Design a binder for this molecule. Structure first.
Ligand SMILES: OC[C@H]1O[C@H](O)[C@H](O)[C@@H](O)[C@@H]1O
Ligand SMILES: OC[C@H]1O[C@H](O)[C@H](O)[C@@H](O)[C@@H]1O
Ligand SMILES: OC[C@H]1O[C@H](O)[C@H](O)[C@@H](O)[C@@H]1O
Lengths: 479, 479, 479
């Protein structure tokens, strides 16, 4: 069972140089403000910012050791990535397949493209892939033979075969290892791609996807962990996840709030809050950029268009959906690339009000480390590395974090975070209040404990009242 | 706990002449096809087709007696209306208020408009009322005094005061009486208007509305009934109801299905099924006509406009929202007035596929008696009475129902109903299957029982495969 | 080679009672105004107004004999339908299949659906058929066996198998017989359906459709006939036909002209005229109603919507494309149902200007008999028969035709027809003239012969000047 407290999303090495510096900054600044951490992939990896792991059972020496990861458990919940879709081509299992071909004992762990026969143009066209190449990578075996394996992402990421047994055995092995290190929340990355079936989109193929998901959830349960399955697609999948006793993502909230604040409109936000899925992990910013498919239906299309044009006229290029020529179309944008503080135009009041609304939304709130420090678009890093998403992946030295922690806007955010992590009304029931169409009123009640948020979207004001239980007096949070 | 079986929606006197003839038709035709019945208001009433009851403790003698109603219980579940918002001005309670004024012991039962003081123009414009008159009725007391009471609907309907204690006692008295006659599901009419507060819309004012609803729900539970609170507004209210251990309505489905079949599009339909409110009572047609606010957000606005223009170009006038000049707007239409069979253009395959999708949707399916008999738009009835909704409130003699029962499409619908009412797979868990964007695939599993629906929206084909328990083998259902 | 003169489109029995009365009216009124005739199907038929022929080798006695048909040849070109897609289920060939099953010597003549195996939902959905049923009919053999044959249209129309040899042998027999009765122009009905291949749309499947089409063209030529292949789809198919020495239809013209006259716009008309296909047969009205797919690209979508809404707002219901819910969409309308005189609002000047533009368009112009007589929408017939297309299939007695011929608008149309049929400039080359955006100027030159049409679309004026070569002087045509 997880703590109902704010979580930090952070890299192993973007705050100081490593996991030790990370722990130093966390105890120095956040020890009363968070109850958990999502540490992004810290295993050996050769692509995609950690998500091409050679194994889930080892720490990259550049980051530290397993003792450095266990330095967090015992005081904080620990959320760690489980890359269910693929592993690195430098993993022992895949190098063995390169070395021994189909005589390898790990041969059935990978998807062999030629075992599907001819795939028709129609069936190629259905496949849900955001890259403009076929998801097939041709490799050279040790004996000079060439064979093709399924490859959704970059070529160093070779997809796992959930028609075989080896994939499930591999994942069960990772989970047992991760939970024995104190991981109690498993983020299931890109789970929607685990179902390959020609004739389908090969993405979230149901009911097959929920059987994979129930199996992982059951394995996690017997090992003391819960699951955070990650999908960027229609909101409905978030309810499917929730209804199967797993934690979905509140991916709808960031673009919904951005629109709500920017246009002084509370209509869609309140409708979403009244129906939002149970047991969410909520985010405003992530390590990825603001995802558009997650808010379809939650926000009318014309209002998503407003948000898209508003952001893209002011920040870096979005990430496009595949073969989508219409840059003003909802259906064409996958993610806007913009820090959340810059999406709100560095407006301190708007940003704190966004965080308050996040924190009064049902579910466990995650704060991304860049948003924690009110970071701006990192143009210089993006130009240094060539990775668009680095515009939202700032590095900070420990001194730079000390300095950022002194900003008025960050001190207001710390006060909120402490309140959300500690005040007991959040452990009770959510109760939305009536407001006009340009403001939001949100409350939590648990016995005598009670707190109330009012946000005016016109003027970006945030007011929290709460009951100090020893007396009956209502107090103001001062944030 | 209700039977997980098909229910019939019917008037007390539109199948034959009374409740005795209703029971005759039900035992002759439907005793293997339904497990429950929603008999529309049959009390003494002076407005709006039963929904202005003088009391809930009497049967209008024109319909029969309480024994005619208890003849249905014991074999059938019984869903009955509770008009929580208002009672008749000819009720014993309101006639005492006319006779004795504010010395009446029932003074707190009604809302006294002048006790609000002056209502600003702004605050009048907020009020959620679909009629273009102020919701205030001036009545003359016996002593010649004039005083005004709140009046949402027709003038013979006087709203109840949930700021007083009398309103809760009145409802609790009705519930006790209704449950002692075998009512085990209470449809809570127009409950959203029970919260009056100036400065608000006076409709679904939260959290007050859910306190009213939790209270009635508990009274019903300890008297052996569950609740079906009815709201025609945004889908989110259906989920709010659902998480409070009450049955919401599937009002989203009818216009969603109509669009899905007419435009051969399953995208929005499948997204809705994946996220559906829990424990809902599903409908296609009702006694009121296809309501549009209920599918907002569920379907994009341009597709709702498509549905609106398609039906309005060939059917009777819609019911508008209050001061809405744009007849081509979602925001301007309240209900389409059209029988469901005419909405699907009297296409037997399409109508049967729609019913099959309804029956495989999670929740209790209700079949409206006009839709049961595949009835068409009743132009003559609407012309005789002047009531638009009578275009969907056909009368049948007992002879005419016998005749309609023999239609091939009605016999096909009977087979569906028998299957949905009896086959045990629906008592297990729902399982959506992958399909393309012009067809739907839906399944139910409960142990060894299993049934699978495939509907192709292009050609309106319906196919159900299921496991024959007697043999074990998979069979095709002949409907 | 055909005469470059006006042709009449007519039924066998809609002018008087039969083919004898047809010849009477033609020799009485039209002997200097037309040089050819398209007589719509006059064979034994049991569906679709003649288009389900039991055989092409005999005349239905209700219409007359072959001598009544040969009474027209020798003075007029003779255009007759060849229903290449299907023959009647009461044909000797299909009745032999019912009696003898797959032992029938004609078994290979029809398409047997079960020889395709399972057809996926995707491959069913690709199929181009304008009806909301699967195009499969289950028939009972004489021995009680049930088997299914392909069926695009009504069930009495059984499609022919162009994967077999019998279909070509049958068609070659039909062409040989028709040409021996004097048919020198063969209308090839619905040829686009002759290619059935699962995985494709089963409509205009290239390159095979042109191979079927080259073959018919070659058989027709060696029997003394040319071909008029009939397809309603994108105009590009009209050019594909034209490049294969066949006559395409000018289906683009009717909706293009209507828009041009109704909105006083010549832009799209002139662009089409400058690039229009080469050997076409031009029409304004046909026996079917104004077909929309033929004008896509030729007219912008927004201007097609204008035409659709303008006509549908004041005449009978359109014929829809399959499962198309948006009644204001181009993609949803197949044909408007309105006589061409009513589509122009019975405006005599506008109508005569339309015919002059038709006649000055390159190609052989056909005049439909209802348009000949300036006929209005025949609602009484449509209500009597229940067929929508009958609003455009008026019956006239010989006397009613005598009266219609005396109407001033028809007398002007006669002068045009005589002029277009006889003046030699039409045997030369077309030359478009510069005009503003609300008028059209068209000329024909052949040596010393020259004629020029000016139409003002604002005021519906039409002027023709022509050279009397015997005298040299320019004269005005008084029509
Ligand atoms: O390749 C896997 C992808 O999905 C993961 O869940 C991460 O969120 C993303 O950063 C990564 O690119
Ligand atoms: O006036 C009350 C209204 O709400 C009721 O619940 C019924 O659905 C409707 O027929 C009635 O008119
Ligand atoms: O079924 C054949 C169809 O195409 C034919 O060519 C005719 O033009 C049309 O009237 C008929 O309905």
């Amino acid at each position: 069972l997880l703590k109902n407290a704010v979580q930090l999303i952070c890299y192993p090495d973007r705050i100081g140089n490593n996991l030790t510096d990370l722990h130093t900054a966390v105890e120095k600044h956040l020890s009363d403000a968070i109850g958990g951490l999502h540490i992004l992939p810290f295993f050996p990896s050769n692509a995609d910012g950690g998500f091409s792991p050679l194994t889930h059972k080892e720490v990259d020496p550049a980051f530290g050791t397993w003792d450095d990861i266990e330095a967090f458990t015992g005081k904080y919940d620990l959320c760690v990535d489980l890359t269910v879709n693929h592993i690195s081509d430098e993993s022992p299992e895949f190098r063995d397949f390169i070395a021994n071909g189909f005589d390898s004992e790990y041969a059935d762990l990978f998807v062999h493209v030629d075992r599907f026969g001819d795939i028709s143009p129609d069936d190629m066209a259905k496949i849900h892939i955001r890259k403009e190449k076929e998801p097939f990578r041709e490799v050279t075996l040790a004996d000079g033979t060439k064979t093709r394996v399924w490859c959704t992402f970059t070529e160093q990421q070779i997809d796992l075969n959930y028609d075989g047994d080896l994939a499930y055995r591999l994942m069960e092995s990772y989970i047992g290892f991760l939970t024995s290190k104190g991981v109690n929340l498993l983020r299931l990355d890109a789970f929607g791609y685990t179902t390959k079936r020609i004739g389908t989109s090969c993405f979230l193929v149901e009911p097959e996807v929920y059987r994979i998901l129930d199996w992982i959830n059951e394995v996690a349960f017997k090992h003391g962990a819960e699951c955070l399955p990650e999908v960027h697609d229609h909101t409905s999948y978030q309810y499917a996840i929730s209804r199967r006793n797993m934690h979905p993502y509140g991916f709808a909230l960031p673009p919904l709030l951005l629109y709500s604040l920017l246009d002084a409109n509370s209509v869609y936000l309140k409708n979403w809050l009244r129906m939002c899925p149970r047991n969410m992990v909520t985010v405003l910013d992530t390590h990825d950029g603001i995802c558009i498919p997650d808010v379809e239906g939650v926000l009318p299309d014309d209002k998503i268009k407003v948000l898209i044009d508003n952001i893209d006229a002011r920040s870096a290029d979005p990430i496009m959906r595949r073969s989508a020529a219409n840059i003003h179309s909802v259906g064409a944008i996958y993610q806007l690339t913009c820090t959340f503080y810059d999406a709100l135009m560095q407006n301190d009041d708007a940003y704190i009000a966004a965080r308050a609304i996040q924190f009064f939304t049902p579910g466990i709130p995650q704060v991304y480390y860049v948003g924690l420090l009110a970071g701006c678009n990192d143009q210089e890093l993006m130009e240094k590395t060539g990775e668009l998403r680095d515009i939202n992946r700032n590095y900070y030295t420990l001194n730079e974090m000390d300095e950022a922690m002194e900003k008025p806007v960050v001190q207001r955010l710390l006060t909120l975070m402490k309140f959300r992590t500690n005040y007991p009304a959040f452990d009770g029931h959510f109760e939305l209040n009536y407001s006009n169409d340009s403001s939001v009123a949100m409350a939590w009640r648990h016995g005598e404990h009670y707190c109330h948020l009012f946000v005016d979207l016109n003027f970006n004001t945030s007011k929290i009242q709460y009951v100090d239980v020893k007396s009956g007096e209502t107090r103001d949070l001062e944030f």
